């Protein structure tokens, strides 16, 4: 009973989380996951500011209201070569990564490691935060509040 949460640097408080390194988060789970980081799903405005500070990924993830990919550099295999906050229009499926927004983060780029999942609740899952530099923090707990996500 183990979950890896791979987390990025924060940019104006916005970061990306993937569960087990593959698209596997529903919209309800995404909200719960951000809540566990004392964070919320970003607004479009929040994501645009993060982009302006250097944030880009090659992953679809939830924000409030849409699924998006922030792009700075055009790449043919990431958001069909678009730049800016690319909005997913047409998809059959419901599971993506998520973005999260932590208002208490620094205003620009913060690439220090994440060492806590401060708002996880009691539970039986070994949850491991994995930073890009390999630094890990584990705890026993849970964050999913919807049964359909478990
Ligand atoms: C209100 O949350 C109830 C569900 N949680 C409550 C806390 C908890 C602790 C250890 C194992 C499990 N399964 C659980 C389940
Ligand atoms: C946005 O990056 C998607 C690719 N994955 C690749 C695997 C991985 C491992 C640990 C932390 C992070 N951020 C990542 C990122």
From Swiss-Prot:
Residues in Link domain copies: 13-102
Sites where the protein binds hyaluronan: 22, 59-60, 86
Glycosylation sites: 6, 38, 81, 92, 102
S-S pairs: 9-111, 34-100, 58-78
Subcellular localization: Cell membrane; Cell projection, Microvillus; Secreted
Tissue-wise expression: Expressed in the intestinal epithelium.
Subunit structure: Interacts with PKN2. Interacts with TIAM1 and TIAM2. Interacts with HA, as well as other glycosaminoglycans, collagen, laminin, and fibronectin via its N-terminal segment. Interacts with UNC119. Interacts with PDPN (via extracellular domain); this interaction is required for PDPN-mediated directional migration and regulation of lamellipodia extension/stabilization during cell spreading and migration. Interacts with RDX, EZR and MSN (via FERM domain). Interacts with EGFR. Interacts with CD74; this complex is essential for the MIF-induced signaling cascade that results in B cell survival.
Domain notes: The lectin-like LINK domain is responsible for hyaluronan binding.
Function: Cell-surface receptor that plays a role in cell-cell interactions, cell adhesion and migration, helping them to sense and respond to changes in the tissue microenvironment. Participates thereby in a wide variety of cellular functions including the activation, recirculation and homing of T-lymphocytes, hematopoiesis, inflammation and response to bacterial infection.
Name of the molecule in the record: CD44 antigen
Organism encoding this protein: Mus musculus (Mouse)
Gene that encodes the chain: Cd44
Section of the entire sequence shown: 22 to 171 of 778
């Amino acid at each position: 009973n183990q979950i890896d949460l791979n987390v990025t640097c924060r940019y104006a408080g916005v970061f990306h989380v993937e569960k087990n390194g593959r698209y596997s988060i529903s919209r309800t789970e995404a909200a719960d996951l951000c809540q566990a980081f004392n964070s919320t799903l970003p607004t479009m405005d929040q994501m645009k500011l993060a982009l302006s500070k250097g944030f880009e990924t090659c992953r679809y993830g939830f924000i409030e209201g849409n699924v998006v990919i922030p792009r700075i550099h055009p790449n043919a295999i990431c958001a069909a070569n678009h730049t800016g906050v690319y909005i997913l229009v047409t998809s059959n499926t419901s599971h993506y990564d998520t973005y999260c927004f932590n208002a208490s983060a620094p205003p620009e780029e913060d690439c220090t490691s994440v060492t806590d999942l401060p708002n996880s609740f009691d539970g039986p899952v070994t949850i491991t935060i994995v930073n890009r530099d390999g630094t890990r923090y584990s705890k026993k707990g849970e964050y999913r509040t919807h049964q359909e996500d478990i």
